[PDB]
Design a binder for this molecule. Structure first.
Ligand SMILES: Nc1ncnc2c1ncn2[C@@H]1O[C@H](CSCC[C@H](N)C(=O)O)[C@@H](O)[C@H]1O
Ligand SMILES: Nc1ncnc2c1ncn2[C@@H]1O[C@H](CSCC[C@H](N)C(=O)O)[C@@H](O)[C@H]1O
Lengths: 259, 259
């Protein structure tokens, strides 16, 4: 069958690419974490299709469900907010296929591609989407106009010491920093820690911003400084952006020099 | 008037977001580097609109042209391949507005926003788009599934020593690396140099790939290794991706572990 990993962008109907719309239109079943599925349902894009959201809390379960359905011949659309390849479903799906020993049967490289196994075969494709970094950047100004690093503060499957390594490196390289999964009830110290690490490489007054629910209901853009992040409150719907040693504010906009 | 920086994605019609389509539909005049403008013209999206491509070779000229037209009351669409905020027109435009001393007149933060000056006023908005990183990643597998750094190898407005600093940092932090503007007739040594720097942090057999004209005519996906990049030939239509110490190839796909 087919397994299309559909990146839906920041969350609003106009935010999806036509390629994403078409992938959803041609899908028989749609799988994804509850929040994404509901957004699509609200848009009226899931009408007359099988929708799986129950028991789809875990990433591994979503991937296994989508893969097994695809292998059984179904036309599946597995949705990820933003882009599937950025802290999304692309990795879990490929790692699962790898674990099951599915082999490529079309001689191609990269994706899309046809893979097969004793269970059956699957045509896998990834539909790219506007990732959080660019989506929030468009609501800020030109914060990512130069070299940038994308870092997730989720230490669920990644040891914190490795994340600190990533942060120190971003600091020394003078990279604009975009923090994905900046904070949660459990993970309430990671953001502050990240700010303290970067503060060893750039000024306290360095531009920073917290953009919540970009392109969605209750969207919020909060401008602050790197020092301000030490006490800032972020959520799972927030993306944080930290400027480099050249970033500055310009009439309400977050400007990172192109040169 | 209006100045909409429209990110058109990788280059194919289905690759644009609906928001981008709508911004183009509502524009009276469209400005952009020749190649992007031609792609849109081919798509049939510039019919009945004023199209400026002549003399639009330089980024500064494109920005000034778009800004002055907007200030004169025109509804302008300035196009950038991928996303305007990633080595695109967002920075040049804001820096120019800053230089002219345009002031914000709506009390808002970030963008969109209304700015004004003795010359007139302009409503500025950035329409995000799928940037090269995610677009090529979708044609590779899950290469960016973990922390990633975006680096441009264009040393036109950025001293090479700073780029080397960025590269060494990406290496030590064990970041997946995406190289924008990897090579040109003039800049034919930067890619090799970049590979040699990263080779000090990760194995020669580390997965790497060169993706040319993603989603366009003559699209090409070439898989290789970090060592292979030392002699690889890239162009201005190519994006290079270098895996981290955990990246591996899986049945033709470029897989970077999510955890
Ligand atoms: N609309 C939105 N506004 C702000 N941040 C968002 C967002 N959508 C996703 N994110 C960011 O991404 C995190 C989830 S991780 C999944 C990210 C997704 N694949 C992408 O490409 O964006 C969130 O915790 C947040 O930091
Ligand atoms: N269709 C495509 N395929 C491969 N690389 C592309 C591409 N479009 C843009 N790029 C990459 O981007 C460079 C131009 S820099 C402008 C990038 C653009 N704003 C974006 O967001 O992608 C190219 O030299 C190349 O490295």
């Amino acid at each position: 069958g087919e397994l299309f990993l559909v990146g839906m962008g920041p969350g609003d109907l106009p935010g999806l690419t036509q390629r994403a719309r078409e992938a959803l239109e041609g899908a028989e079943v749609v799988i994804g974490y509850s929040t994404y599925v509901k957004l699509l349902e609200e848009m009226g894009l899931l009408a007359g299709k099988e929708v799986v959201r129950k028991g789809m809390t875990e990433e591994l379960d979503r991937a296994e469900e989508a893969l097994e359905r695809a292998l059984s011949g179904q036309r599946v659309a597995l949705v990820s907010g933003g882009d599937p390849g950025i802290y999304g479903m692309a990795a879990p799906v490929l790692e699962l296929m790898e674990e099951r020993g599915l082999k490529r049967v079309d001689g191609g490289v990269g994706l899309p591609g046809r893979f097969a196994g004793e269970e059956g075969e699957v045509f896998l494709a990834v539909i790219p989407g506007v990732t959080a970094a660019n989506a929030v950047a468009s609501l800020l100004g030109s914060p990512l106009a130069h070299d940038t690093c994308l870092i997730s503060l989720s230490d669920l499957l990644t040891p914190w010491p490795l994340i600190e390594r990533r942060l120190h490196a971003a600091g020394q390289g003078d990279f604009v920093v975009v923090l994905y999964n900046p904070q949660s009830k459990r993970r309430d110290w990671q953001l502050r820690k990240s700010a303290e690490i970067l503060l060893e490489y750039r000024p306290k007054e360095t531009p920073a911003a917290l953009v919540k629910s970009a392109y969605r209901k209750r969207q919020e853009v909060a401008l602050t400084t790197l020092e301000g992040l030490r006490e800032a409150e972020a959520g799972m719907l927030t993306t944080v952006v930290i400027g480099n040693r050249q970033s500055r504010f310009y009439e309400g906009t977050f400007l990172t020099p192109r040169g």
